Design a protein around this ligand. Structure first.
Ligand code: SF4
Length: 553
């Protein structure tokens, strides 16, 4: 196999036998075949737009197909076979529509050479073998491979956020059009300038999509606000909801109300605690456990059903017993886990089986007590702008350090904890995404009532951090966002984090430290471009990086 799209890729080079995440050969290869079929859809969908007859009927299928191939999203080979088969059928529908429109506009049959992604077909028995030859290693030039895969990796991150927006009824044609432009581009022979421009365009579409998801989430559930979140437990059976999808949360809360089953969040659902629409339910207890990579023992000890709305779902250990109460939904899949089907238009998912099972379960094991404070998204922080700016001006707050992003399991990640612990006491950490779990249960206190860790929310709520930085740029009358007293020490893990990074590069943020290692999918020459254009940096020692950041370097 060959996969290198996440931080934990083997030898920081590529997973070749079995993924470090657990993804086996067969699954990895099926994901490659799905992306190949998506490129085929893209080739005809882009041509139909160019002819003036765009067909948007595959928008959601494309988002969902890309999302299903994100790290720790979907482990169910039968789901990938179904998506490949359905993708071939959708592709051929687009092909036949394109052939007819082309013939009408040109007075002759289409006869131009097309990439294999546009024309190959087979039944599911053919998938495993074909999959071997249509993966990443089919592109041998290292710079073409690097810029095509960087584009697809950021694009999948954008697709995940676009899917959450779409679930909530928010869509923009430019996003779905770009999915096909970007996919199709990876079958074309393009100059380096053209390939780099597409990656930067992906960063601008990450800005568009992150803004759209921020609009979707806050229009539907309110602006996040300062909240103290219990991390202890109650004495009722519960359901634990994990991943990122807030509409699933809204429906689970409504369905569990009055049933005697409590709701708990996990992982990237912690920010559901911050939204006014959800704070109104008394049976919403708080947040259980820690980061995604700790979920085997914590899903076990939770005792009730667990609902994965998105990644990260990690394979069970052999001694884990919770498969019978593990539920997937959305693009998530796992062999042997019960899947909650998509809601129909104008309808709701049905979580009744989780509720019935919960009542047969013991209450959660308490693994810690106390609280986490959060809800500092853009409306809440701008509400405090005068106090924050006074603190800057008085020197009470010397610097902000953005430590947003995505966590993972490697030991080197203790760096982020150590940076948080060792930063001077007149600094404030800004965070979003599960990278927060390296430092959100410390006792760093506050500065004149402003907490020293400000959690804006999910990794997508890195959007709020950019909005805050742009506002402060204007308040301080600066010509360059980089001259703010803000440093960026971002942790990444999978493809959403990469989308966030590309958004920040599109916004002109330079000097970012990215870790705990750099992507395997940057060739030497592509790494150099990003260094020359954006001064991206690897992490160094805790003491060295703190001292450089405090100097604005
Ligand atoms: S998703 Fe990450 S750990 Fe899993 S196979 Fe790909 S690079 Fe390896």
């Amino acid at each position: 196999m060959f996969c290198f799209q996440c931080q934990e890729t083997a030898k920081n080079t590529g997973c070749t036998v079995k993924g470090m995440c657990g993804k086996p050969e067969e699954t990895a290869n099926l994901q490659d075949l799905l992306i190949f079929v998506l490129r085929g859809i893209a080739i005809y969908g882009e041509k139909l737009k160019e002819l003036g007859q765009p067909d948007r009927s595959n928008d959601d299928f494309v988002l969902q197909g890309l999302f299903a191939t994100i790290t720790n999203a979907n482990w169910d080979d039968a789901r990938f076979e179904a998506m490949i088969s359905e993708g071939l059928a959708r592709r051929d529908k687009l092909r036949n529509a394109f052939l007819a429109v082309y013939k009408a506009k040109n007075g002759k049959d289409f006869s131009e050479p097309l990439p294999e992604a546009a024309t190959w077909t087979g039944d599911s028995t053919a998938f495993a073998e074909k999959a071997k030859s249509v993966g990443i290693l089919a592109t041998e030039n290292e710079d073409v491979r690097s810029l095509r895969e960087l584009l697809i990796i950021g694009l999948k991150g954008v697709a995940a956020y676009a899917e959450h927006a779409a679930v909530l009824g928010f869509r923009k044609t430019e996003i779905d059009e770009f999915m096909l432009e970007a996919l199709a581009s990876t079958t074309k022979d393009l100059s380096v300038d053209e390939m780099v421009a597409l990656v930067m365009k992906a960063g601008g579409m990450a800005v568009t999509t992150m803004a759209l998801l921020d609009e979707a989430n806050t229009t539907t559930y309110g602006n996040p606000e300062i909240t103290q979140v219990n991390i202890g437990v109650g004495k009722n059976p519960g359901i634990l909801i994990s991943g990122h999808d807030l509409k699933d949360m809204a429906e689970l809360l409504k369905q569990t109300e009055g049933t005697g089953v409590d709701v708990y969040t996990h992982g990237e659902m912690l920010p559901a605690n911050y939204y006014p629409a959800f704070k109104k339910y008394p049976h919403f207890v708080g947040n259980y456990g820690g980061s995604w990579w700790q979920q085997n023992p914590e899903f076990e000890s939770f005792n009730g059903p667990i609902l994965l709305t998105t990644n990260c779902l990690v394979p069970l250990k052999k001694e884990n017993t919770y498969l019978d109460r593990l539920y997937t939904t959305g693009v998530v899949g796992y062999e042997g886990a019960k899947h909650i089907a998509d809601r129909p238009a104008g309808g709701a998912k049905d979580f009744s089986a989780l509720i019935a099972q919960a009542k047969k379960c013991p209450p959660p094991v308490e693994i810690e007590t106390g609280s986490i404070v959060g809800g500092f998204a853009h409306h809440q922080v701008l509400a405090l702008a005068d106090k924050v700016v006074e603190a800057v001006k008085s020197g009470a707050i010397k610097r902000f350090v953005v430590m947003a992003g995505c966590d993972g399991r490697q030991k080197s990640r203790s760096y982020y904890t150590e940076v948080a612990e060792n930063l001077p006491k007149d600094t404030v950490i800004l965070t979003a995404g599960c990278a927060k779990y390296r430092y959100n249960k410390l006792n760093l206190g506050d500065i004149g009532g402003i907490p020293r860790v400000l959690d804006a929310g999910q990794c997508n709520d890195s959007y709020s951090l950019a909005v805050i930085a742009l506002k402060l740029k204007e308040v301080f009358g600066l010509d360059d966002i980089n001259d703010l007293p803000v440093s960026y020490d971002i942790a990444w893990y999978e493809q959403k984090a990469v989308a966030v990074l590309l958004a920040l590069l599109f916004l002109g943020v330079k000097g970012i430290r990215l870790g705990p290692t750099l992507p395997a999918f940057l060739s030497p020459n592509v790494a150099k471009v990003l260094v020359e254009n954006f001064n991206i940096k690897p992490i160094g020692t805790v003491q060295d990086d703190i001292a450089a950041m405090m100097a604005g370097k």
